[PDB]
Design a binder for this molecule. Sequence first.
Ligand SMILES: COc1ncc(-c2cc3c(C)nc(N)nc3n(N3CCCC3)c2=O)cc1F
Length: 839
Amino acid sequence: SEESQAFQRQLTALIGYDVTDVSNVHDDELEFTRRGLVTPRMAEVASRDPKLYAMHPWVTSKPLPEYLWKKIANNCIFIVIHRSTTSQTIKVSPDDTPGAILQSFFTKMAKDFVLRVCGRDEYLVGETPIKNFQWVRHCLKNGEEIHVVLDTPPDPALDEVRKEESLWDCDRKFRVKIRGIDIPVLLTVFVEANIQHGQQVLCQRRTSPKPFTEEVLWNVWLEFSIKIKDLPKGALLNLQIYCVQLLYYVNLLLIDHRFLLRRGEYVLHMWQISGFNADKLTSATNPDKENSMSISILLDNIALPRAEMPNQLRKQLEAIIATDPLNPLTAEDKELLWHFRYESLKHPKAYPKLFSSVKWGQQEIVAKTYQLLARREVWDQSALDVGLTMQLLDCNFSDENVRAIAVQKLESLEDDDVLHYLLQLVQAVKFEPYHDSALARFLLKRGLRNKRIGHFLFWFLRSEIAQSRHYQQRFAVILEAYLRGCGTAMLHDFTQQVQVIEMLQKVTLDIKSLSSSQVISQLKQKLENLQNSQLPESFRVPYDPGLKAGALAIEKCKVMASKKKPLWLEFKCADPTALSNETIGIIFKHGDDLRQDMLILQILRIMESIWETESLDLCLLPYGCISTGDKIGMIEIVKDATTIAKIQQSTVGNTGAFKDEVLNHWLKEKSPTEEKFQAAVERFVYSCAGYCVATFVLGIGDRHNDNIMITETGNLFHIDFGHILGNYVPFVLTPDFLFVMGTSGKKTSPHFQKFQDICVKAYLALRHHTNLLIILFSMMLMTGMPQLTSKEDIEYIRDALTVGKNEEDAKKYFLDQIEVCRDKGWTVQFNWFLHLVLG
Ligand SMILES: COc1ncc(-c2cc3c(C)nc(N)nc3n(N3CCCC3)c2=O)cc1F
């Protein structure tokens, strides 16, 4: 076709990568994965209720928390239904199905149609009680009204999808022939060949070192110790170059996507080393065929197809099944898990440890391991454990089958929870030995089934494609698959968004180079230009798919006085049904890898829902933060907020003679009444408690004053998590914070004691999820925070969470942390100043 070759040029512009391209490949895997993905894409498209998918109701099925019940005066929810200019407040009960509120509106008045949210693109369709809509729970949580605009449902037509048009037999020890290396531009140098499987080295060999020149030959055959028949699927040939110090590396999947052993000549362009992480595992070769080191090799020139237990041993097994994810396994622990594998199968918590005790380098062991996977009755039975599920998905498990069972346990996640783990699940795609996987397809299905998950899946993939050459290819094939089944409706919004963001980026990069108030000239000037025959009517806010941004409030926009020059943008809600005029404040920025920030903000959301299991509310503000390309993205602006440093700075800048009372005054200054003031003190006790715990666990507690904000309503929140991570006292409980809790240097108080009891109850609450937090944190550092791995960096969280210790021993560990915070005063703060704001 041709109207199918225009559609191709378009997708490539949204992907930010040219998929169909074949200049940096050495096989049909990616092309093969595209073909393989046509069926999962089509099956989900052909199975999604057209209407329900057009309206994407945002429903949860979790019990309404205690705090939102104590927020319902009398089983009576006040929904304000607005038509044209009319308004009608109605009385609804926590089980009033949305559609059933029509027989409560057409019966409750007189003298087909769906409810939408005012200003938002957030419908209230489907067979669900109102107490199960995030929008509703968000109205009740922050003591707000419930505005609805009765209007015509969207038409599923706009969601139109464009019409789619033997190895176990040779005891031959494995061998690889090194032809040689050749860097186009420059010591001693040797090749290192490893046969790996799930971060587990099966065999190693090297080559006699030779002088480091523009071309280095060898013509050697490296005979490994692994029989051809013993090579597990997912096994990688990892080639490295030392001088001893590492310089280059590349990977080749010994068994391919067709289950055939690799044969023939290979010229691979090797990735460099800068100056552990997920990039080091890629099957992708360097696209930069010029600068980059190369390697020539050759492959051979074969397809792949109950008793009792003592008591001391039982207690030895249990001691191991209990140990946290990061606690290592002795060869003794492993032989133990393996010998009692059948007793280890009855315990789902044993799976990551038992499957890590398997010598994958042996055909017969894997054979029994699969016979073990056949007796999954217990695993399949057990309730879904995300902490356990994520574990079988990390860098430690390269076997297709083990991983698949974990993905199989994910199928039962409702849309609400997919959104909580989407970002990490997408980052987990980097651990997949193959381009096509149960996980890659799962994200595709979940992405196509619901518009919200799909909108977020897009940016997550888009972000990775634009700043990772190690994984862009695999991701590009996944995004393309998604874009060919999301519909023309969404295919259109992603176009508006890409257009809008790309114009703004250009403005950031240029205003960045031209550096005063003279700069304000261009900023205002360029912003008005783009506001014409460019910037389309309105785009969806990327970090909040519900919001639409209209015209650019030029007057409010500016450049910030930071090291780099991020823009401070403001837009009118492009939707008239809006209950206000409050603009949409977005911070635009180039110069930082915003992915680190996304990961942290996402862990913050996981913590809130962990605290929702225990009917708690630590009042955090995990504001929206979307990376949109190479070292660039946007950041939501919290309305009515200032830096804690700015509240101090009022009375001195060049000094910082930190007055232990300015904060409490500021709150009263901003509080309309004195009564609301107490609620702003209330919200402070909680938000300050939340970030104290969370920040401490994540080990980002040592914050530099500037990087802490407060709402004119009591909510406290840290910001700029990208800082403390991009360069590398417990948390932050300064005398001015404590002065809002009625205390000084050394004393107690009613409000303070409460603070200290919200913390311990939140700290221990997180410990009931040790394994989960450890996996996320460990999985976070590996895939998004290079130069923050080493191993010793991963093990920080083991101590923060106080592993081993009973609840009672931990409570007195956190309380002491709260103490190391008082015996410090402003030493810390004043010290940041002597530095950040100086040297
Ligand atoms: C990753 O990098 C970032 N992370 C965070 C910010 C940042 C968020 C921010 C928010 C969410 N709300 C409000 N009301 N001000 C903000 N703000 N202010 C502007 C100036 C100093 C405070 C911010 O700087 C900016 C970054 F660049």
